[PDB]
Design a protein around this ligand. Structure first.
Ligand code: MNH
Length: 452
């Protein structure tokens, strides 16, 4: 049979999800329960997977397909038919996949990189122009950078999020909506007077996001166009199979999904990577050397990012220890036995604990908690399906190369232009908005006096 956590009667496991940090609670639960453990809530059942040998079967394209998590279903209201939230047996997913995949490529990455620099320059100039006494809120400023990067590159819109003291209205509203998604999963009873207040708020926040997208289409509508871009590939992009462009109503959904999924994950990754680089001096020294040798010219070139090897290794290791996308869910496409020990009826839902998967001691050695980028010196040596932070198969992050390209480029310039000091020996605190980010992580960054 299949182990499961403590069920309080009617609500079963569901009351456990109330905590600020659900994914970490599930990791604790997985440490004790074992490879797999069942997780049943009233009206929904899902089995969490933590051992790699089960992950490799769950990941097979001809064995299990992607299922929408309970929270992702609520995410649909602003995101919807966007690939991250669209179904695999969904029409719009296939159309959008085929026509937005060419917008991510080597030629594409070249298209986006020159504009990425601009936003990273805004970040570097902000940190260079800070006074000596001031300190930097890494996750906040990383979200600040990532929004502007994705906006300017993939939608020709400058959020100008750096010119704002407080988080952008988009950030506030997005985080708040994710709040309801998670917090309504954990909720026992769907209807109650009080929730109406909440409900009100969540109509409000969403609108802001909607309103913001209205600018991108309107702005580009009024200003000059015909400059190859994601938003172009959405307006004028056409489906090879059906010869059809995207639905305007669906184009806006694409914009929502891309704006949201392009910063939170990348910004959490940058914060986590900087944190781990701060806790270990030597792993920084190596990367500070790499960025200097690889990037000579003041502005990084499209080729210079790919030339950076150690930066990508650092990013992959930091992404291993704390994958910014905490989990993905999968349903069985036909009756199978998982591991040869657990029989599952078709359509059964299994969630996958990516951070617990990376902590499997058998594959990654008996010092998994140890953060050493050198593990990724020969990334070929890593076993199959043991390391899947970006997802699996066709369903895995069309712009993952953009994630790595922006994050590597930015981090290379950060280590190039700055010296990082940790004034609090920061206690690692992970805030969850369906995504993992350090909370309270503050460092100072002295200038290195490098141009542009
Ligand atoms: C860090 C970086 C990063 C991580 C950890 C990441 C994680 C994921 C994971 C996991 C999935 C699959 C979810 C599931 O349930 O199967 C996924 C799918 C997706 N992701 Mn991303 N993703 C990005 C960067 C990331 N993504 C960026 C950047 C973009 C946008 C430019 C993006 C846009 C998507 C889209 C779109 C999908 C949907 C793919 C599909 O369903 O066909 N992404």
């Amino acid at each position: 049979e299949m182990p499961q956590p403590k069920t309080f009667g009617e609500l079963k496991n569901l009351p456990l999800l109330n905590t600020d940090k659900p994914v970490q609670a599930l990791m604790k639960i997985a440490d004790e329960l074992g490879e797999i453990f069942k997780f049943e809530a009233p009206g929904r059942v899902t089995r969490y997977l933590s051992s790699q040998r089960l992950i490799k079967e769950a990941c097979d394209e001809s064995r299990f397909d992607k299922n929408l998590s309970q929270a992702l279903k609520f995410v649909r209201d602003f995101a919807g038919d966007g690939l991250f939230t669209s179904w695999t047996h969904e029409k719009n997913w296939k159309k959008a996949h085929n026509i937005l995949l060419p917008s991510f490529s080597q030629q594409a990455m070249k298209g986006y990189h020159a504009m990425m620099v601009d936003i990273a320059v805004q970040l570097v100039q902000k940190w260079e122009r800070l006074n000596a006494d001031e300190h930097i809120e890494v996750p906040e400023d990383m979200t600040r950078l990532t929004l502007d990067t994705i906006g300017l590159c993939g939608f020709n819109y400058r959020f100008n999020s750096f010119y704002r003291d407080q988080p952008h209205p988009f950030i506030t509203s997005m985080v708040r909506a994710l709040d309801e998604a998670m917090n309504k999963l954990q909720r026992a009873n769907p209807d109650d007077p009080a929730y109406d207040e909440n409900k009100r708020q969540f109509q409000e926040d969403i609108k802001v996001m909607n309103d913001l997208v209205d600018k991108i289409i309107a702005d580009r509508k009024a200003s000059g166009e015909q400059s190859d871009d994601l938003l172009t590939h959405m307006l004028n992009g056409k489906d090879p199979e059906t010869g059809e462009p995207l639905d305007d109503e669906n184009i806006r959904y694409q914009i929502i999904t891309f704006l949201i999924a392009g910063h939170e994950t990348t910004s959490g990754l940058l914060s986590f990577a900087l944190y781990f680089l701060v806790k270990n001096p030597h792993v920084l020294q190596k990367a500070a050397e790499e960025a200097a040798r690889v990037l000579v010219d003041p502005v990084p070139s499209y080729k210079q990012v790919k030339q950076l090897k150690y930066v990508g290794m650092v990013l992959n290791e930091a992404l291993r220890l704390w994958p910014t996308a905490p989990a993905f869910s999968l349903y069985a496409k036909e009756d199978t036995v998982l591991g040869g020990e657990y029989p599952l009826e078709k359509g059964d839902e299994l969630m996958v604990l990516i951070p617990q998967l990376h902590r499997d001691k058998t594959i990654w050695g008996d010092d998994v908690e140890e953060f050493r980028p050198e593990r990724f010196e020969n990334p070929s040596a890593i076993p199959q399906h043991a390391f899947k932070p970006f997802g699996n198969g066709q369903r895995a992050c069309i712009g993952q190369q953009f994630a790595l390209h922006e994050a590597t480029l930015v981090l290379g310039m950060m280590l190039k232009h700055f010296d990082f000091e940790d004034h609090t020996n920061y206690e690692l605190d992970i805030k969850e908005t369906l995504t993992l980010k350090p909370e309270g992580f503050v460092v100072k960054a002295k200038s290195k006096k490098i141009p542009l």
